[PDB]
Amino acid sequence: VTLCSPTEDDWPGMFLLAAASFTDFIGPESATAWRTLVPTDGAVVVRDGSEVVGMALYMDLRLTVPGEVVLPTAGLSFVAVAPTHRRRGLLRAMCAELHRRIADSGYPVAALHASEGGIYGRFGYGPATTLHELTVDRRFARFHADAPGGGLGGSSVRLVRPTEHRGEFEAIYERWRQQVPGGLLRPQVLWDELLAEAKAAPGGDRESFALLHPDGYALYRVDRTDLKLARVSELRAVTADAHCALWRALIGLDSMERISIITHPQDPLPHLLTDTRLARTTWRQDGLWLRIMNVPAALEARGYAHEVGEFSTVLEVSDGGRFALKIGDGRARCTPTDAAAEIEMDRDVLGSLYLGAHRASTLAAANRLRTKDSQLLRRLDAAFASDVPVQTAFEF
Amino acid sequence: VTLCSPTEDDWPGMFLLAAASFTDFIGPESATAWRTLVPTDGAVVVRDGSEVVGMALYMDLRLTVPGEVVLPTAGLSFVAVAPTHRRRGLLRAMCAELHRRIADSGYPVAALHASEGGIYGRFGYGPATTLHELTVDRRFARFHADAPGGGLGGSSVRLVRPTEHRGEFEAIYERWRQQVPGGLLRPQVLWDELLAEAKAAPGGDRESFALLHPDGYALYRVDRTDLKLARVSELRAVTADAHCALWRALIGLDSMERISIITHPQDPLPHLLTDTRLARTTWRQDGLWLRIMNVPAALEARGYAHEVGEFSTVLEVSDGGRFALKIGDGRARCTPTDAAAEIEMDRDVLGSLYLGAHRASTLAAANRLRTKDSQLLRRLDAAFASDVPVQTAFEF
Amino acid sequence: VTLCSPTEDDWPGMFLLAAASFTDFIGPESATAWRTLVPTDGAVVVRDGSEVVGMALYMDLRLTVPGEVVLPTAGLSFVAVAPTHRRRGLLRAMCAELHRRIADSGYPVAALHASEGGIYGRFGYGPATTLHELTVDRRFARFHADAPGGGLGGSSVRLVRPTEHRGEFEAIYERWRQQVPGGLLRPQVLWDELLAEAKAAPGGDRESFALLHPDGYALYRVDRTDLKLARVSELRAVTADAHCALWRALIGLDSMERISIITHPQDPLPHLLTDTRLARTTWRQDGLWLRIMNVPAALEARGYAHEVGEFSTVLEVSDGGRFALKIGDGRARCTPTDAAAEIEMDRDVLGSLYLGAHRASTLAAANRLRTKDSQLLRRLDAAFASDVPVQTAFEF
Amino acid sequence: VTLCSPTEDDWPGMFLLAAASFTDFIGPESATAWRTLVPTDGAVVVRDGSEVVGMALYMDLRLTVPGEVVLPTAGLSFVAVAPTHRRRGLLRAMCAELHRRIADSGYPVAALHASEGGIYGRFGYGPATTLHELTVDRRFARFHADAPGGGLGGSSVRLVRPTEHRGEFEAIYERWRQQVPGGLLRPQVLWDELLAEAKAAPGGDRESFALLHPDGYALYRVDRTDLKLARVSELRAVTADAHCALWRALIGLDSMERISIITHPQDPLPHLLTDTRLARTTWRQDGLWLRIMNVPAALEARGYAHEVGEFSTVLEVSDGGRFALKIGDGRARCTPTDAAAEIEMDRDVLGSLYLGAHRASTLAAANRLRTKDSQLLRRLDAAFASDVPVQTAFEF
């Protein structure tokens, strides 16, 4: 039982572990298209002797952080251990090895989508974003008088087939993912897989449809079993007008009873209607997890709030070291130090705070970050707060 | 069809309307005990001729706003129109007559709990707090190493009967309601009714039990049909230690599978556990609704964030007039004016912003509040943000 | 095992059988009030030897048949055989004995409400009325432009306590039950029990409410578990304006989501709304069962349609004999004969046709009534067709 | 916003609008086969400017009315508007244009199947047939002694594969559709679609089977998820003997617990069983909708009841003129007039009455048809009543 990099002979064996560990595994076909994003020396395997019984890999992704700064991010995926080799310490060996490779490759941050909220708590990964499923009873849904595009006249939204307007979607998404914190770059290979999942599979999902705006798009599909529910798989909108214009079209679906969308907590849809409660939050869960690899490099690259007063403090990470942090006028200075620490927090506590979805005061009451200065807490709350609402791009 | 104040002969007719309109009507018995909080001329009735076919009233309450300031608040309750006289315009007359009396009684703000999120949107009421039902699978629940009171020793929490410790609960709640925004003063009569609902009703609710801490308490009861669920009806905790100590006791219930609590979104519970995903938000809804009656009086009495630069702007309320606002050092200056306005919003929009549950940027994207200056928006978001997270006190 | 009339000592044993056989047994308390409607030698018991192990009785009722004629009707009720003595022939012995007593007392017709549609098919009882449960989604419900009382002004419907208006309910019901086919007389003892079932029972049903009109009333209650459903237990309307005005009030219950009512197939409610489909038929079942005791007495006393041409024919009942029937201008002559039979049907087939709920053409297609004259068949459909729609009064 | 006839270049765009608006859309393949029934200039489209956003068409169909007379009927189908162009008045323009085209082609009546019972209420369409689902628990279902084919002997029903016996099915249906009111002519192209849906689709419906009587056929299939329910999609029987013969076969399916069938209210199935209540009506809805295009041409071509006295009256339609009607001996005379009106009804009210599914007394109670003569009402009920029970043919 040892650890090494995989070969071409290992890939048929890696699909077998994937299909048995992941129920939503996209088959042996699509995993090759996802492989084009995995860099060389970006995957680890464990053999027994010998059959492959452990695997874990990261992808080269581009995550947008607050202040429209794009960071190279290691996207952890395909992390699976055979049921016959658990409790031994294969995950502990694989994840510790990959982080060593991620740190050598020069990645400031590492990210993943968790299957459970307890596996990746100690590994330094913290829930950085929040998924927020909204379900709208569209039969009662009526827009507020203040909602944009209230008058009569040719609406700027069109009902189009998703595969026939690909070039337009790639352009809109690119404009979205650069200005919205949490946005990820979608390469050519990922549009290939997303657009192939739009056509109706025999015995699977229904045919997807698209609503097209010059500054946004809605990618929806009717549920296979619930023929009265339209499930919006994707909603990208650049302008505030584009968001409202796409929803007037979505509630326009007179064939449907309900419209469901997995979105972000600060979605302005509830206020867009007369009855705010008609946009019910049916489901809430953490989305994208973050592990800050390079502490000073990640904190400096992020954009902060201009509203907060200029302050300086010494921050301590569990086993990441001790860092001096200077925040003022939107930008931050971060350099390694050894002066007396004011705030003490674990590696995963910084992960949650980074994108600004979780307040430090909330984590302080939970005693996840410790400080004797209560005024410093109020300043970290304001400084880490993102100007543009945090969103989850896509699952990987 | 005429509107007037109720006499002693009207109450028997009023209880008829109340029982036919509200399914959870406490009965003609308990409604008289709730009446002791309604001031003279604080109720209105509509008769047909003659039987009463429309009623509305408010209660004298004390709401705590950001900055530990306690405001006199009109608590709109018992608002019902007979099913034989709907679409006739009885509510429009009654609510207008009560607001008149509320303004003449010098109340800065009015408050209610909505049965539907669309009825009171036009009357100036906006969702001021947010409810957040957390269901924790306690079997999988394990506390984080950072959680307070992690070591062994005699726990300061006791399992006591709620009716036998009334003096302690009243003392703890009074401390809680004064320091937490959204907190309401609970008089002698409401404590009488709360403890009356603790005892198990024949064929109804089960017997309530209490967990008592020197600085907090937990009121819970087993669900009538779900024998494995413990429903925490009330959780009040003054100190950060008390919150954690009470939750160790609640997860200590080895008889139960799940512990459910209706709380606020900023609850530190999920971070207390090793698995944050175990504290599942099963239900989300608006709680307390607010209508600002006296605009300058309400805004000046409120405490604001220090972590924002001093600014001044002219705010306009759709039909409430025009006001100049100066925010600096956590306090605000507000007086009526007629100089050009920089921000335009409806009366209900201010209600949502007041306690600081909703951000101004979110309402701006929904075009509920309008401005040309985007810098002002960022400042309004930070200034209105509550330091101590907002909580819903009780339902009325 | 012997059959005889019951004494005073038998009653405590009868209530044991009733409680063990009927789930909705009103207890030993209320069954004594129902006993005041059972005439002397109108009840039979079967003892073992000695304990009572079989019971059956009939009540002196007054059924209104087409043409506003009221016939004294024996109402079979409390028919139960102990589980320890079934498949023995106790029911066949009891029912034959009661049919002897009914015919000796001189009742033209016999009536019951069946627990299964197969037990009383052989005994001569046929499904005489059809129950029709309509559940209306009142949130979507909007009245048609042609619906009576569709303007502004004081509505003539009141929301009242049912127990405080007994005098008016009895008066309206009496006017209703006399003009509507299938209507039964309700004695003082039954109004006693009806109003006693209106009050809220601890762990049972909720408090019942009433909507009163000069020419009609509606008794409704919110379901014990479904707090968004209001069940109309009773809707007596004399005039067409009363029916419409009560349904404006019923849909006026803004507290509820759905209004359910068990009524008749010829209810004008669906056409009273803009969308006829909003009044969905959620449940269909047979109501009152009818067995003609005296074939010539019943057919003569009934009222027939004036539209059909005058015809004379000979009909035969399987074991009831052969009768010549002369139908012309509302009234009919029925005298026993030995001439050639043109129509042949079982005793229960006449029972179904009598009130005019089931057409003869439907039974002829099923071969329940036989004839070689198809022109005679069309004349039977028109003649037995009730001018005023057939309704079920109350269950017994 | 322009309305015109569709070209060949419009069809790919029309399929997109069809698939998005209809969930049960038969795909771009099958819609071409249905288009062989759409006559030249029998379709309309609305373009934006240009993309097609509104569409509506009618099919050349042959409906059988009471009296075995077959009328050419325009079958409205594919009527849909884009979700981006609703509340604009596209349906009002399209339907009015088609009604203008239908009248020019010389059609007496127009027909459709509605998605909601409120959209086509004002356009002149009324519920003309009634759907009636019956779920029979075949485990308890035992046939009555009077039911045809009682004793032993070789049954004249066979279990056959539907695709191998196309010739007989077309022969039986043609006999059925000509003698039964509501019967539609099913051309060569529609039998292609019906038999193509018989084969088991991967992940969809299961293999369809057929029961063949020389005078009737039964098309059934086991439900996708409910492996104990046999869904009878089609039951056509010419003789009353065949109807009973097929049901002995259907209840013969010992693999099933329940047999469901969407039929008509006057189905003689319950009277075939010893327990009439085993044939439970689980579902009840309106079927075919009829708009009378030519008032005198349709009324004269219909067969009326012989069992009614001869009468003459003047009928009006709100905005469709005034007509003199004379009914006697089964046939009617109708010519446009301007003499004082006796009966006043909307255009859709006549549609409901025409096929004889809805009684005039019920519609007069709901004030949908007004007359001061109550005697005239009783005669309209008897005259319009169809001798042969009305049935829904197929869904279009």
Ligand SMILES: CC(C)(COP(=O)(O)OP(=O)(O)OC[C@H]1O[C@@H](n2cnc3c(N)ncnc32)[C@H](O)[C@@H]1OP(=O)(O)O)[C@@H](O)C(=O)NCCC(=O)NCCS
């Ligand atoms: C695959 C995998 C992580 C388990 O491998 P494993 O061999 O049990 O992991 P290890 O033995 O190295 O465990 C190391 C630590 O992680 C924790 N851990 C591992 N799997 C866990 C799980 N499913 N839930 C909670 N904690 C887990 C253990 O508590 C352990 O702590 P310790 O060091 O104090 O003993 C595990 O998640 C699994 O089997 N899941 C199914 C496949 C899957 O869906 N993967 C997740 C993709 S995001």
Ligand SMILES: CC(C)(COP(=O)(O)OP(=O)(O)OC[C@H]1O[C@@H](n2cnc3c(N)ncnc32)[C@H](O)[C@@H]1OP(=O)(O)O)[C@@H](O)C(=O)NCCC(=O)NCCS
């Ligand atoms: C009680 C009550 C307001 C009904 O009275 P009503 O006579 O319909 O009220 P009015 O006719 O004065 O309504 C005036 C306006 O309020 C709106 N409105 C009133 N009740 C409403 C409801 N239940 N939902 C949505 N909007 C409502 C109407 O749209 C109307 O607008 P308009 O002025 O443009 O016509 C109504 O809320 C009700 O019946 N609710 C059930 C009883 C209850 O539980 N009370 C509410 C507790 S929050």
Ligand SMILES: CC(C)(COP(=O)(O)OP(=O)(O)OC[C@H]1O[C@@H](n2cnc3c(N)ncnc32)[C@H](O)[C@@H]1OP(=O)(O)O)[C@@H](O)C(=O)NCCC(=O)NCCS
């Ligand atoms: C009460 C009662 C009928 C049972 O008595 P029993 O001794 O089984 O009746 P018998 O043996 O005299 O049955 C005589 C005939 O009636 C029929 N019958 C009796 N009970 C029946 C039932 N529950 N369902 C269908 N048919 C029944 C039998 O087919 C039998 O026919 P047969 O003479 O060809 O054998 C029976 O219905 C029962 O026990 N029900 C529970 C109490 C109850 O609810 N009463 C009925 C209210 S309508």
Ligand SMILES: CC(C)(COP(=O)(O)OP(=O)(O)OC[C@H]1O[C@@H](n2cnc3c(N)ncnc32)[C@H](O)[C@@H]1OP(=O)(O)O)[C@@H](O)C(=O)NCCC(=O)NCCS
């Ligand atoms: C197709 C269609 C009716 C939408 O068109 P539309 O542009 O909204 O119709 P219009 O704006 O011309 O509406 C005209 C009238 O019809 C009524 N109406 C339109 N759609 C309606 C619906 N879904 N339900 C009830 N009423 C409706 C409106 O009340 C309006 O009345 P008004 O003249 O008093 O304002 C609509 O049914 C739809 O979008 N559904 C999806 C496709 C479908 O299923 N069609 C029905 C096939 S049978």
Ligand SMILES: NC[C@H]1O[C@H](O[C@H]2[C@H](O)[C@@H](O[C@H]3O[C@H](CO)[C@@H](O)[C@H](N)[C@H]3O)[C@H](N)C[C@@H]2N)[C@H](N)C[C@@H]1O
């Ligand atoms: N317009 C504001 C409305 O507020 C209240 O409704 C509210 C009820 O009062 C609430 O009931 C609560 O308050 C009542 C007393 O009013 C208590 O008896 C009960 N235990 C408690 O749950 C219930 N939980 C929610 C409901 N919206 C008033 N009853 C009616 C009034 O019209």
Ligand SMILES: NC[C@H]1O[C@H](O[C@H]2[C@H](O)[C@@H](O[C@H]3O[C@H](CO)[C@@H](O)[C@H](N)[C@H]3O)[C@H](N)C[C@@H]2N)[C@H](N)C[C@@H]1O
């Ligand atoms: N063979 C005819 C049978 O009719 C009745 O059953 C019927 C019950 O009497 C009915 O109960 C009704 O009648 C009883 C009184 O009999 C009322 O107390 C009750 N509120 C009311 O619902 C109930 N709704 C239906 C049931 N089939 C008799 N109880 C028993 C008798 O054998």
